[PDB]
Amino acid sequence: NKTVVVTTILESPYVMMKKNHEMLEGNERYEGYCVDLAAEIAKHCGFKYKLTIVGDGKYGARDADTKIWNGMVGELVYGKADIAIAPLTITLVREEVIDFSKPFMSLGISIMIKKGTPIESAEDLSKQTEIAYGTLDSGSTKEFFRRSKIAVFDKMWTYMRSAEPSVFVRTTAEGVARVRKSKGKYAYLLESTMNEYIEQRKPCDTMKVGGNLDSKGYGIATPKGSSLRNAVNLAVLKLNEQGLLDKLKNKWWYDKGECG
């Protein structure tokens, strides 16, 4: 038996550096929802594992010209990792090159505003110009807008792709900071899960507004032909059915929420 290499991403509250990480070793350096989930998946499937943080800090996209996959998807496609346990969105283009388990969490694209921003919906954002808006610069949210045929989102993509300066951000943290420092003049499009988490964090100056734009899931991903595929899929189902996944969401989102 070989130790399973797990690719993941520093994204709060999924995977975070522990405050005393420099004094700890291996998997013990990290904490969060996905750290807890990895330990359980490994236990139920009967494997030893090593958490690794994706080298380029990205989720996964295929470059238009080079056809090279980056991010966690790349690590799986190119054989650098055996499994991805992360807030990695199940999409058709990804499912064509890797396998996903059944989803372990639901989400949809959503709008983050600085409190008091006169925006209720995606329609509102598309109808006006004073408030800028954007997405994570690589990921499923950007691709949703790029590939969309619905009029509001098509109009939104047409604005976003040509906006100057760039409305796209390198990390979720950068998007959140931009909202917080822009005095209501920037709104951020991000997954409801991350939006909901930030809403419960000091300085309690952001909120989710409106309905989700779509409905999808995060899944645990393996390269095609992985011997882990079946066991991992069944483990996610078992953990959902036994109430663990709901427990972990409560633990990391709400139990220690900082906004009352």
Ligand X SMILES: N[C@@H](CCC(=O)O)C(=O)O
Site of interaction with its own copies (CB under 8 A): 90-92, 95-96, 100, 102-103, 106, 144, 147-150, 214-217, 233-234, 237-238, 240-243, 245-246
Binding range to ligand 9C3, per CB under 6 A, among 7-15, 35-43, 100-108, 193-201: 100-108
**C-beta atoms surrounding 243 within 10 Å:** 9
**Three-state secondary structure of 89-101:** ECCHHHHCCEEEC
CB of 46 to ligand X, least distance (A): 27
Residues β-bridged to residue 49:
4
Please, which residues have CB within 8 angstroms of residue 92's CB and are 6 or more apart in sequence? none
Give the residue, chosen from 136, 156, 176, 209, that forms a contact with ligand X under the rule CB under 6 A: 136
Q: Nearer Cβ to ligand X, position 47 or 221?
A: 221
CA 36 – CA 15 distance, rounded (Å): 9
Residue 52, beta-bridge partner list? 7
Which of 82, 99, 191, 199 forms a contact with ligand X (CB under 6 A)?
Answer: 191
Instruction: Please tell me whether residue 251 binds Zn ion under the rule CB under 5 A.
Output: no
Query: Shortest approach of ligand 9C3 to residue 136 CB, angstroms?
Result: 17
Residues numbered 102 to 121 that lie near ligand 9C3 (CB under 6 A) are 102-106
Alpha helices in 109-241 (DSSP H): 122-127, 140-147, 151-162, 172-181, 192-199, 229-241
Determine the straight-line distance between the first and last CA of the chain, rounded to whole angstroms: 47
Q: Tell me the closest approach of the beta carbon of residue 58 to ligand X, in angstroms.
A: 8
> Which residues sit in the known binding site for L-glutamate?
87, 89, 94, 140-141, 191
